[PDB]
Design a binder for this molecule. Structure first.
Ligand SMILES: Nc1ncnc2c1ncn2[C@@H]1O[C@H](CO)[C@@H](OP(=O)(O)O)[C@H]1O
Length: 174
């Protein structure tokens, strides 16, 4: 059956907990719709609706990826008014993050995946449906962790929440 899929990098439990606390402190409920703590992630490549045959092809392509791990330090926060999101990010993302995304984006495009032809802006979405031009505080201190793997996720909606289901993970070769 066709599953809406995407590749993502996840955050350690402690940092996610620090983020939702920082968010609740600086952003009122009317600033946007809050992303659940377990849904905090950094999307590497969106694939759109993809079937089992093509999912299997894309997984194989992901398995041939050979790339060392890298460190993410979240020193940047902002707001995209047109896309209507409040985001967390990195001013100077490591080349590894850029390399990994580009490797995965070019693999989906050569498999026949829906294309946006938009630049890759590594970010972690905190608020959705943000309309008003609120004010963005700097992120918390020392939101920095080592990236050890990336995951292929399935997107679904179950009883009033958005749910991401992990399917497969690939480690980065250190
Ligand atoms: N049709 C589409 N085209 C481009 N990007 C899309 C999309 N549908 C969803 N997205 C985006 O891919 C991520 C899915 O976890 C989300 O990004 P973020 O979670 O905000 O980083 C969607 O906004």
């Amino acid at each position: 059956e066709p599953q809406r899929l995407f590749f993502a990098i996840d955050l350690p439990a402690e940092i996610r907990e620090q983020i939702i606390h920082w968010r609740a402190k600086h952003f009122p409920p009317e600033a946007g719709r809050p992303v659940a703590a377990d849904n905090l992630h950094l999307t590497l490549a969106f694939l759109g609706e993809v079937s089992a045959e093509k999912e299997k092809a894309l997984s194989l392509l992901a398995g041939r990826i050979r790339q060392p791990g890298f460190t993410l330090t979240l020193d940047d926060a902002g707001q995209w008014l047109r896309s209507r999101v409040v985001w967390l990010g990195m001013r100077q993302p490591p080349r590894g993050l850029i390399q990994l995304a580009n490797m995965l984006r070019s693999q989906a495009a050569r498999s026949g995946c829906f294309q946006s032809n938009r630049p890759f802006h590594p970010h972690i979405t905190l608020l959705r449906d943000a309309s008003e031009a609120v004010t963005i505080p700097p992120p918390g201190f020392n939101w920095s962790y080592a990236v050890t793997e990336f995951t292929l996720y399935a997107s679904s909606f179950a009883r009033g929440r958005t749910r991401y289901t992990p399917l497969k993970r690939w480690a980065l070769t250190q």
